[PDB]
């Protein structure tokens, strides 16, 4: 099971770790990425768990396109979780780098109610453009479902944590 993390509240949890090894370590029923609508796993912890699936993640992603259409900001899908969990939640949060509504934020977290447990990464922190700390903040605020955080950044973690409120 999940080992190391910091417990901030009754559901939320948080380590610095990154989100492809912990993924290949617990194998855990549900893994979030980062995605974006069309589900293009270009960088940050989309790119990342895409390229530790060998791509079959980009594959599977493109075929759900493909029949669906692109994601809401906000959204979600569950598709395969490959060789790094039984499923992937694909959940679009908002991209501050491309305007769209922080508001959408708390919209993003809800998708993880759905499930029991998560391994996660902070949404729409990194290359999303978020501020970390507001993400975290609407994280324990809206998700009541067990959520594991995992930090990528070392210096950001303990940022997180020394700030927690």
């Known amino acids: ?3 190391g993390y910091l417990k901030l509240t ?3 949890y948080i380590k610095n770790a990154d989100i492809v090894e ?3 370590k617990v194998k855990p029923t549900v893994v979030v990425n980062a995605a974006n609508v069309y589900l293009k796993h270009g960088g940050g912890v989309a790119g990342a768990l895409n390229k ?3 791509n079959a993640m980009q594959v599977e992603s493109d075929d759900y396109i493909a029949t669906n259409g692109p994601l809401k900001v906000g959204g979600s899908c569950v598709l395969s979780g490959h ?9 679009v949060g908002p991209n501050v780098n491309k305007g769209e509504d ?16 998560l391994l996660a990464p902070l949404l729409s922190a990194g ?16 998700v009541r479902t067990n959520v594991y955080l995992a930090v990528f950044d070392k210096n950001l973690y303990d940022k997180l ?5």
């Open 1 to 3: 099971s999940f080992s």
């Open 10 to 12: 009754d559901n939320v």
């Open 22 to 24: 912990e993924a290949k």
């Open 52 to 54: 530790a699936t060998n």
């Open 83 to 91: 060789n790094l969990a039984k499923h992937c939640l694909h959940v």
């Open 102 to 117: 922080i508001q959408l934020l708390k919209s993003a977290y809800e998708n993880f109610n759905q499930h029991e447990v």
């Open 127 to 142: 290359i999303f453009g978020a501020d970390p700390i507001h993400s975290l903040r609407v994280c324990v605020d809206t």
């Open 161 to 165: 944590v020394s700030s927690f409120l």
